Enzyme design. Sequence first.
Site, PDB file in Angstrom:
ATOM      1  N   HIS A   1       0.525  -2.023   0.054  1.00  0.00           N
ATOM      2  CA  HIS A   1      -0.441  -0.478   0.009  1.00  0.00           C
ATOM      3  C   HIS A   1       1.068   1.282  -0.106  1.00  0.00           C
ATOM      4  CE1 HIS A   1      -3.416   2.332   0.826  1.00  0.00           C
ATOM      5  NE2 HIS A   1      -2.704   3.848   1.376  1.00  0.00           N
ATOM      6  N   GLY A   2       1.137   2.016  -1.462  1.00  0.00           N
ATOM      7  CA  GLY A   2       1.051   3.041  -1.410  1.00  0.00           C
ATOM      8  C   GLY A   2       0.871   4.185  -0.503  1.00  0.00           C
ATOM      9  N   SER A   3       1.118   5.707  -0.145  1.00  0.00           N
ATOM     10  CA  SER A   3       0.369   7.153  -0.476  1.00  0.00           C
ATOM     11  C   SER A   3       1.452   7.866  -0.138  1.00  0.00           C
ATOM     12  CB  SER A   3       0.361   6.884   1.340  1.00  0.00           C
ATOM     13  OG  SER A   3      -0.937   7.612   1.526  1.00  0.00           O
TER      14      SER A   3
ATOM     15  N   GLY B   1      -1.366   9.857   9.733  1.00  0.00           N
ATOM     16  CA  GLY B   1      -2.442   9.479  10.076  1.00  0.00           C
ATOM     17  C   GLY B   1      -1.643   8.265  10.247  1.00  0.00           C
TER      18      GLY B   1
ATOM     19  N   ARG C   1      -7.708   3.296   7.166  1.00  0.00           N
ATOM     20  CA  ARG C   1      -9.236   3.477   6.944  1.00  0.00           C
ATOM     21  C   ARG C   1     -10.265   3.659   5.507  1.00  0.00           C
ATOM     22  NH1 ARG C   1     -11.337   4.973  11.786  1.00  0.00           N
ATOM     23  NH2 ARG C   1     -12.850   6.518  11.030  1.00  0.00           N
TER      24      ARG C   1
ATOM     25  N   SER D   1       2.598  -0.127  -6.646  1.00  0.00           N
ATOM     26  CA  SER D   1       1.876   1.081  -5.318  1.00  0.00           C
ATOM     27  C   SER D   1       2.888   1.963  -5.438  1.00  0.00           C
ATOM     28  CB  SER D   1       1.641   0.345  -4.183  1.00  0.00           C
ATOM     29  OG  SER D   1       0.790  -0.773  -4.098  1.00  0.00           O
TER      30      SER D   1
ATOM     31  N   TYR E   1       1.480   5.945  -6.119  1.00  0.00           N
ATOM     32  CA  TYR E   1       0.906   7.037  -5.255  1.00  0.00           C
ATOM     33  C   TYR E   1       1.480   7.354  -4.141  1.00  0.00           C
ATOM     34  CZ  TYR E   1      -3.123   3.885  -6.905  1.00  0.00           C
ATOM     35  OH  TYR E   1      -4.249   3.049  -7.756  1.00  0.00           O
TER      36      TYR E   1
ATOM     37  N   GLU F   1      -5.305  -5.736  -8.133  1.00  0.00           N
ATOM     38  CA  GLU F   1      -5.539  -4.565  -7.400  1.00  0.00           C
ATOM     39  C   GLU F   1      -6.344  -5.864  -5.946  1.00  0.00           C
ATOM     40  OE1 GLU F   1      -7.409  -1.008  -7.827  1.00  0.00           O
ATOM     41  OE2 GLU F   1      -5.953  -0.651  -9.607  1.00  0.00           O
TER      42      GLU F   1
END
Lengths: 83, 333
Positions: B187-189, B196, B203, B229, B232, B312
């Site tokens: 999971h990339g962000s 957070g 979330r 990922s 992102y 995905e």
Amino acid sequence: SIPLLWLQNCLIRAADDREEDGCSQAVPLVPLTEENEEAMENEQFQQLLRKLGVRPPASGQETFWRIPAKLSPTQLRRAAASL
Amino acid sequence: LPKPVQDLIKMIFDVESMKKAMVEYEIDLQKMPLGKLSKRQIQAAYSILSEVQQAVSQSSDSQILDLSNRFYTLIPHDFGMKKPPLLNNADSVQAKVEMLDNLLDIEVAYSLLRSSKDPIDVNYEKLKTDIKVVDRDSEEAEIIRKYVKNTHAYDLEVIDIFKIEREGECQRYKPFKQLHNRRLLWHGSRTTNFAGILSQGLRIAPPEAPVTGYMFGKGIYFADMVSKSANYCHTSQGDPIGLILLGEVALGNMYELKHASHISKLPKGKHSVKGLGKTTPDPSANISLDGVDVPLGTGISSGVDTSLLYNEYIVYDIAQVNLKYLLKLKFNF
């Protein structure tokens, strides 16, 4: 009735786990079959769930109903024996 | 705390970073400073987007104009010398929903920031997450570097691997260890989201967020290939460092899709969505780590009629996710 029996076994296993562990956490009811999931989406069944003490999923973040951690092995066993 | 952890804390709580992210989203920082970002306002902005969603599926130029003006009033943008773009179709709904997702995480970070100890230690403690450095020579680091290398314009280098344990999350995830088909996934962000993410976990977008704003509806999204990922992270030459999660995801029965579908609820008996990609880790080289699949095979052709390039994976209950590792990556362009 198949969903009812699955519910009963869920309640009893949660009772056993809490009693054995000594501390208790919220437990999701995780339907594994379509029919059981269908039961979980049924208004009647849900009304039964609420009386036994099962909480609906939290808005937004959850889909599974939860057995609240507050329920003691005794309460769970009573709920299970009641239907 | 170990130097890499200290550096991790500094970069995720970087206030100047949060500001630049906001500016990148064309937010008017002068009209809405970082400090006046509020949960209430973001919630109401999501709701407006849900009104645009409804208007679009039915809608006139003037009610589009007013919704647009309502949105921009709540979240002031700076469009320079351009006319402010109307929120006129699904594309604008998705673009605004994604920006709100990021604003929400930025608000959580800044709220955490609000001489007992070092500022580093205080901020670390605010994360309520145990962060340990993984030894580069461990089997752990080896597997993770292989997963990165094999499932990789940029080329990717692993700088630091952190083992992470969010308070309370092991107990929350535990019942789903009973569930079959558990996978270690990416999971990339954006870096500005990770304060957070560590304090609250991954979330789902809220009830008032528009379902049409999300390719597979409102759930938590993962990839089995790091390059998917990595997109992102939104890294750039000017700043070539990104952060990416490894999470164990209890997928159970997968609802397999070949195109975008704005799911409100899984079909009965399904526990996740798998979007089927053109490319997939070679199933031959999958390994199992105590009942958890790690698809670290190099990318081969899946042989699947799909519009997706990569697989995905999406779950719709937050307790189905257990964060395991955080990687600091170098993007070398």
